[PDB]
Amino acid sequence: LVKVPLVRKKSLRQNLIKDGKLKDFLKTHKHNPASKYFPEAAALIGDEPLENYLDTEYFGTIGIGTPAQDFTVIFDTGSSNLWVPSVYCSSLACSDHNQFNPDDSSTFEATSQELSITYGTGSMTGILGYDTVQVGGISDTNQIFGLSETEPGSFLYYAPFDGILGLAYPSISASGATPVFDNLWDQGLVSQDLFSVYLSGSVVLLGGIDSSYYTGSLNWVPVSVEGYWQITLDSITMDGETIACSGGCQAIVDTGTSLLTGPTSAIANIQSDIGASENSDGEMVISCSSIDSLPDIVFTIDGVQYPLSPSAYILQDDDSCTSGFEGMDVPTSSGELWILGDVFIRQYYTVFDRANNKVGLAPVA
């Protein structure tokens, strides 16, 4: 089976906290995760292009070129581009990361096309090139990717990743560059037009489904809008009570974030009920000792119930327990939108099917 092992590491946020940098940032910027998903939710003043990856926790490794140069990357279902930093990246922030040197690669082919990458909070500038990408043991030849050269923000210096490998639909790829998964499929390098994610780290399984990772039967849900891995949510309940998504709503399955993210108001209510409070470094801490007294939250999808127990929605680290919930302000006309991140995936093995445009889910084993 083609397996890409994932390692769980402290987040960019945690690193910012530990260096005492987060406070100042937050005082002068207004963070809205909604900006990754809507061209309209952007920050007016965006000097931190990677702000939206504050909370990513799982990373994988890929090789690029001949012979291979390695990089740690985020396997992101909420984006579609592949990019890594160029050796030409002079910025301070590029300094202790792996960078790609095209001169060292006998298979590299330059292009004159510019890459402009944005995740809603400022842009990164670079160049597009082709090379062979080593992923899960496979050699993905003629893969177009970006080499970033301009200021990526101070956040990169503290990030546990070098770059990002997008897993969404091609419709949302900047410059229409072909995504990794599409090129693999196009070249007949994978068994089937689908992929699955298992979080313990865990693995990204390319072109397969492994029954060892779940119990029960898989439940299939159609993708409702092709672009992100977007589905229809039926409701959200907390103590038998409907707390949000009344009469249905939209949800995006996103591996590039660890948290459950939803509209500010629903969220403010949930935080209050679970006993969380916000600290200086701007986190919602909860007492670890209070876990056993919390209620489950249930998402109903296509008429099936997916409960998350407190042990699931509350993150337990070193020196702390933190809330796995976060809020965002979605645009006007946009309807209610929830984002399902690691917290959810860690409990429900997820299958991403491109052949049929559906998502499948089942309780982990």
Please tell me which residue in 162, 254, 342, 353 is annotated as part of the active site.
Answer: 254
- Picking from 222, 183, 226, the residue whose alpha carbon sits closest to that of residue 206 is 183
342 is catalytic: no
Strand arrangement, sheet containing 321-323: 277-278, 284-286, 321-323, 314-316
Active site residue 76: yes
Tokens matching residue 69 = 């140069």
Q: Would you give the end-to-end CA distance of the chain in angstroms? A: 18
Which residue matches tokens 């390695």? 70
**Any idea which residue has 């939250």 for tokens?**
297
Best CA proximity match to 147, nearest among 187, 182, 186, 175: 175
Nearest-5° angle of CA 12, CA 269, CA 255? 35
Instruction: Single out the residue of 251, 199, 219, 205 nearest to residue 56, CA to CA.
Output: 199
Which residue, chain included where needed, has tokens 């061209």? 39
CA angle 105, 110, 111 (to 5 degrees): 165
Displacement of CA 333 from its chain's centroid (Å): 24
Token pair in block for residue 361: 């889910």
67 upstream amide cis, omega within 30 of 0:
yes
Q: Give dist(CA 271, CA 265) in Å, integer.
A: 10
Give the C-alpha separation, 330 to 74, whole Å: 24
Which entry of 76, 140, 162, 342 is annotated as an active-site residue? 76
CB within 8 Å of 78: residues ≥ 6 apart: 36, 37, 168, 228, 229, 252, 254, 255, 256, 257
Does residue 253 contact residue 345 with C-beta atoms inside 8 Å?
yes
CA separation for the pair 81, 200 (Å, rounded): 26
Sign of the CA dihedral with 104 first, then 109, 113, and 116 last = negative
Question: Exposed (0-12), middle (13-18) or buried (19+): which is 33, by Cβ within 10 Å?
Answer: buried
**Catalytic sites, residue numbers:** 76, 254
